[PDB]
Design a protein around this ligand. Sequence first.
Ligand code: FE
Ligand code: FE
Length: 323
Amino acid sequence: PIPAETGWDSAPGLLEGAMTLDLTPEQCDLGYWLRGVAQGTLAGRAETGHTDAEPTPEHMRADGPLRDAQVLELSCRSVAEAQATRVLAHYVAQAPDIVELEFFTTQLVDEARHSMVFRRHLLAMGVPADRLHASIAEVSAEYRREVLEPILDFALTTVRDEGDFVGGVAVFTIIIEGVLAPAAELSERKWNLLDPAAGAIARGAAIDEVRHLTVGSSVVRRHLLRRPERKAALLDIVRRGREIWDGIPDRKHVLRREELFQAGMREHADLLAGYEVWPGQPLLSTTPEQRYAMAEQWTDRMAAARLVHMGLPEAIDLLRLTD
Ligand SMILES: [Fe+3]
Ligand SMILES: [Fe+3]
């Protein structure tokens, strides 16, 4: 009996699961993760995230804008997930008790796995093994400096330097993953047909992320119930997260890879045809600006549900993106 929310076929989508499920760290202990994720979600997918029935097509190995789009995105994601692993190590170190120790251990290994399958897809796309880590660093350097390091510094300052465990979980789950998971859902929808291996990689990570998002919400929710006087402190953390994001040139980087993806779609439009990136919307008929704005809309929709569940509805207006 593998749980329904971890099953490769039975698991909800990312936004769907994060907005509807209630998972607690108590429920998602290490035994749950070993049986349900390592032996469940990842059965037959341990080394690369995907099976042989889900190829890296030759058009993803051939030089061109579609490959350039995936190389840019997965170089950035692989670095982001590796740095997140290092930051999450402090959440394990300072976990208040065994229940959080176990859950954030599982999330730490999840993020390290995400980093691994993203970098291994770069190899499957013909990045030379002896150039892998240096090309990853070259391609992602501007993104790491301008986007990744500011938000992970915020999490690190909050958990390590200030010793605020639930404050740091609020940072990681509201300001980081809450903000970035909708682009991950969009990534899976964009790539499912053009790069089946990458679609399947994204799918497994999204199932993990349902758990990360719902459990992080539970941690914040339970803290706020036990210590209602801490609401003000949580809201100021959220306010500072918004200010940090406002100084980050996120749109510039997203549109860079969406313009590459757009030129790549042009070369494989026969394959896409009527494929819909979301209901009633063929992927071919979207622009970079339109996919960016839809990811922001998804961010707002998920944030309204999650912040309500956490008891921080006052944070919704602070974080609203669609203006
Ligand atoms: Fe991840
Ligand atoms: Fe995650």
